[PDB]
Each structure stands twice: as structure tokens, then as C-alpha cells.
């Protein structure tokens, strides 16, 4: 019964580690893209000066 | 991303506390035998013993 | 212009509060050192309870610790206001810290101060009277309380027996306010402990009135005064003070009395340290609030 | 408090001993007679009787 | 001319509004300080409800906090009109800000 | 309770950063437009000279 | 814009002072243990200790 | 008795570490915000060329 | 204007949703604790049979 | 913030001094045994020994 | 004798490290202020042009 519970409940930690690394990379990309999207709106100031 | 609270941190803290309590219990078990604790385990069997 | 003047006054108050916080920190560090030394003395005395242990070596140990306590008491000063070793000739020395500048609604200006008392439990080696928290004898008895009462305008400390409320209510006593009447004896609630009291005009010394009563069925109407007498069942006093410890052949009973007196002094000193910490916290909160008020 | 041979649970307001003794209350054992009302002590708190 | 007079009146009302806003801000800051102190008092007392804790220390802490409350109440005054520590003998006092 | 307070009170700082950048750009535009509006009133001097 | 006062600057200063005080406290906590400070925390528990 | 003192006095280090990291980040954000507030002031010079 | 009013309404709904989520999380934690306690009770009783 | 003083650093310095003294005492204790190793310890027990 | 010489001569390097960091920060502040003092004298040129 304990073995069945473990099989039904436990998680194969290797793919969770892979997902953790992938989500860290995705978050880094998202932060970089968000910073770029925040910065790019300042280009309009050149025309008016 | 909320800078004042980290729910994942609280979940990790709760997990760490649970693991620490279980580790202390099993350490007492492995250091002094006694499957049934002093009296903090099932009282009836301890009383019979 | 008026608000700018008030802001300058608030800045001055903030500087004074910083100075007071520094003084409190120094005094509290001295208090912690005294706590540690007193705990060491108590441990040494407890170890001295053994008859087989020689008492001379422990005697110079306590002598060195007493000299250390004196050094702690006199050295812990910031700007001449050490908040310790005060003069208890009047017995009511009070020191204050400038807390806040308050302008009253009716065109008035005043400066508020935070008071700290050094009466008999936070003085640390009174200079002249030798009646401070240290260098004084502590009464050691099972069922008594040390109460301070002012007589003829001057205060004093008297040891009188204390009676529990449960015994009073079990014996069939009639109560009224802070006064009780179990029968031929009367009691007043001067503090958290009940004590037997004299009716009136017995001492004839102008003692403070403990409580006043009325008819209340079977209660005499009189102004009651706590009984200065009524010694406890076993009136035992500490053989020597903390600053005059000498354990050369005292005996078992003297050792127990000395240990009890040392513990009482340690408890009073711990209470004083807690009070000092509370004062420091209040100073910090007041400084933060004054900063917020100045910003506003 | 068991009204009959069977036990039961009851909720009753509790009165501090200081409140009773302040208003001139006669006492005898576990009885209080402050005024017309009568109070008794059950285990540690005084309740109306 | 009438509209110019009304404009001058509105400028005066603006100055009064600024003064009232400053008064309310000071009162609100003092109010928050009092709320925080009372929350600390309640926390200390609910800690002290245990019988194993000596109550003299809690009593002296509460005395210090009450003194702090008194100081905050009497000090939170901007220009005399402090909106706190009023006279309730009459029954009700109403403070007004020019709107 | 702390997690609930955090979710009810905390702010997702990313959109606050976006708003901060947007308001900086808007203020720059407003200052430029205000300077133009202040300057344009001097054109009338040409007629009278 | 008022050139002589910056209320946002005072708010930032107040926040910085609060964070600095909390940081000093937590550095003391992490460097010397003592959940209950010397005596500046809850005095009753310190006295008991 | 020593265990009781430890329970009454000791602090879990993990929670203090989380607080230290949070306060460091909050200090960094507060300093950046204060710098932005200071830099806000001098923009008025564009009106006066 | 109508769409802006709707956006404000949805923001209020978001705040209410956060509050409700906190309430549900607290209730679920309490339910889990109760389930664990009742499981312990059942284990004790089946031991005591 | 003052660059001339560091209260947290001073408290850390005092703590480090205390740990160093205690560690040196325990190092002598573990090197040579002799819980009462010198007259700096309990003098009466040293004299008796 | 060697222990006494070390006690009389050696330095508790931790506070020297603290002083080194403090003097680095103080020098950075002094250099920044000195540069500002050098730069501020050029403001007079605006009047004469």
C-alpha cells in the first residue's frame, strides 16, 4: 500500500529540476523583454526637442 | 512579484520545520530505541509496558 | 514664522532625546554588567553551601566581585548624569529626559519630560545613606511584605506580615473597597497583599491613611492606617548586605539568609534593568514620532 | 453541572472577585452576598447563584 | 469685476484648503502613531494573560505606553487647532475646513 | 493570515515600474508643451516694430 | 512643482529610516541569536529567561 | 530548564535570513526611488532655458 | 467612459477575488488540520478495539 | 545613514569577541581536560584538587 | 612572555577591516564633493554671455 501511494503521489524530481531551470531562464528572458519594452517608449522625446 | 511577502518562502519554512521535527523524533528513536516514545506516543501501550 | 520656530524647537528636542538615549544605553550596559556579577556572586554563594568547601577562597572571590560591582557602579557614566549611585538623603531623587515640545491651545508653550525614579530599587550604591538596592539588608521571611509608608513627611520601609485573600474569604470576612473585617482584626489592601491595620490615632505620627470606611452594616466608620508593627511569625533578616558579604564561619542559617537576600537584590536589579529597557524603547518611539511630526 | 443524573454542559457569565469585594460583599467559605444577588465559587470563578 | 472678486475669494479658499489639509495630515499621522501604540499594548496584554508571567513588567510597559499615548495626543497640534484632546463638557464640538 | 494580508495589500511592482516610466515620459512631454505654449505668445511683437 | 520642498523625498527618507532600523535589528538577531533582545524587546520574557 | 530557555529565547535562523534578504532588497528599492525623486526636481530648468 | 467604469468595477472584483481566495485558503488549511486529527482519532480507536 | 559609525558592526564585533573568548576557553578545555584547569576557574575546587 | 607581547602589540584585525571600509567610503564621498566644488564655479559664465 505504501509503495502504491508513493507511485501515485511522488514526483520524479529530475524533470522538476529541469522545469525549475527552464522557468528560471524564462523569467530572466521575460524580465529583460519587459525592461526593453519599458525603455523603448522614451524614443519620442527626440522629435519635440 | 510582491516584494514584502514570499508565499513560496513560507511554504519552504513550513516544510523545513516539519522535516526538522520528524528528524528530531527519528533521531531520538535511532539513539535510544523505544519505538514508543517516553509518553508522547500512544499512551495505552506505554502504560501497559 | 511660528511653525518654523516650533520646528527649531522640535529639532532641539530631538537632539536632547538623542543625548538621553545615549545616557540610557550607558546606564543599561552598566545594569547588565551588574546583573552578570550578581548572578556570579549568587552561584558562588550557592556553591559555598557545602560544608566541606573552604570558605576563605570564596571569601576573596566575593571580595573581588564586590570591588568589580563598585567599579561598575561608579564608572558607568556618560556626562556626569550616570543615573546610578544617586544621593538618597531625600529619598526621592528623580531624573528626566526632554521628551517633546508641546504648544498648548491657549497660546502657551511648554516642554514635556520623561521621568525616571531612583527611590530605593534602581540606585545602585546610594552615595551617602547606604540604603540603596545594594549595600543594604533585605528582610527574609516566608509570609511578610516590605512596604514603604511616609511618616511625618519622611518615607521609610517597614516589614510587616501579609495575609492571603483566600484565607480571608474562607474565614468569613466582610470586605468593603480595600478594607476587610474578619472579626476582632481588621485588614487594609495597601497593595496586592492584605495586611492587618490599626484603627486610628494609635501611632499618633501622622501616618498615611490606608483607607476610609463607612457604616456598611457592621463596619465602623473610621480612617484606617496600616499597622507599622505586627511583626511576622519568624522575623529573619539577612546577616550582611550585598556589599558587605563575609562568609567566614557564618553557619547554615546565615548562609541561607544571605542567599535569599542576594536573590531578592538580583530580582530587584532585574526589574530595574527591565524598566531601563522600557525607557529606552519609549525614547526610541518618541524620537521616531518627533521625526514624523517635524516632517509633517 | 448536572441538573439530573445525567451530566450536561452549561455556559454562565463569570464575575471577578475584585468586582464583588469592591462593592462591600460579605463572604463565607465559597459564598458572596454583595447585595440582593448571591454569588458562589464553583472552581475558581464567582458566578451568580 | 464680480468674477474677479469671486476669483480672489477662490484663491483665499485655496489657501484655507491647503491649511486644512496640513492640519488633517498632522492629525492623521498622530492618529496612526496612537493606533500602533495601542496595538502594541493589546499584544503585550494578550501575552500577559498567562499566569506564568510576572505582571509587574507588563504593568510598567503599559504605563510607559500610556505616557507615550498622552504625549502623542497632546503634541499632535499643528496650529492650535489639533482636532484631538478636545473639550467634551459641552457634548459635541465640530471642526470645519473652508471648502 | 500573513499570506492573505500580503495578497490583499502588496503590489506587483512591475506595473508600478511601468507606470513610473510612463509618467516620466508624460511629464517630459508636458514640460515641452508648456515651454512651447509659453514661447508662442511672443510672435505678436513682429507687427508693432 | 515646488522647488523648496519635496514631500516625496521626505516619504522616501522615512521609509529608508524604517528599513535601516529594521535591518539593524535583524542583523543583531542573525549575529547573536536572541529572538528576545537584551531588554529592548518584551521585558517579561527576558526577565523569566 | 535549559531547553525551556532555548525555546523562549532562540530564533529560527531561516526566517531571519529571509527577512535580511527582503530588507536588503527593500533598501535598494528605496534608495533608487529616492534618487529618482531627487532627479525629478531639476527638470523645471527647461522652462527658463 | 463606460469602459473605464467597467475597468474600475473589474479592479474592485479583483480585490474581492483576492479576499475570497485568502478566506478559502484559511478554510482549507483548517479542514486539512481537522482531517489529520480525525485520522489520528480513528487510528487510536482501531488500535483500542 | 552615517558613514562614520556602524552600530550593527559594533554589535557584531562585541558578539565576535564573546564567541572568540568562549571558543578559546573550550579549546583549552578540550586540549587539556581539567574542567577546573586553573585558579581562573572555581578557586575553591582548584585548591581542594 | 610571547603571549604578553602579542597582547600588547597585535591588533584585532576585524575593526581594522571595518575602518578600511569606512575610510574607502569616506574617500569616495570626499572625492565626489571635491569634484562638485570644482564644477560649481563655472556657473558665473552665464551672466557675461
Residue numbers in the entry:
A (entry chain b), F (entry chain Y), H (entry chain I), K (entry chain a): 347 to 395
B (entry chain L), G (entry chain I), J (entry chain d): 2 to 50
C (entry chain P): 51 to 346
D (entry chain A): 199 to 247
E (entry chain A): 51 to 149
I (entry chain D): 51 to 99
Original paper wording:
The rotating flagellar filament primarily functions as a propeller, acting as an Archimedean screw, and supercoiling of the filament is essential as rotations of a straight filament do not generate thrust. Here, we show the atomic cryo-electron microscopy structures for flagellar filaments from enterohemorrhagic Escherichia coli O157:H7, enteropathogenic E. coli O127:H6, Achromobacter, and Sinorhizobium meliloti, where the outer domains dimerize or tetramerize to form either a sheath or a screw-like surface. A shared feature in all four structures is the formation of symmetrical homodimers between the outer domains of flagellin subunits, with one outer domain rotated 180° relative to the other. These symmetrical dimers are the result of outer domains being able to adopt either an “up” or “down” conformation.
The asymmetric unit (ASU) of the S. meliloti flagellar filament consists of two flagellin conformations, which are identical in the core domains, but the outer domains are rotated 180° from each other resulting in an “up” and a “down” conformation. The D2 domains in the S. meliloti filament form dimers between an arbitrary “up” conformation subunit (Sn) and two “down” conformation subunits (Sn + 5) and (Sn + 11) as depicted in Fig. 2b. Since the outer surface is bipolar, a “down” D2 will also interact with two “up” D2s. These interactions form a 3-start helix surrounding the flagellar core, which resembles the grooves in a helical screw. For the S. meliloti flagellar filament, a prominent 3-start helix is created by the outer domains surrounding the flagellar core, which gives the S. meliloti filament surface the appearance of a 3-start screw. The S. meliloti filament possesses a single outer domain, D2, while the ODS filaments have three outer domains, D2, D3 and D4. This suggests that there is likely a mixture of FlaA and FlaB in the flagellar filament segments of our images. A different behavior is observed for the unidirectional flagellar rotation in S. meliloti, which does not require a change in flagellar waveform during run-tumble transitions.
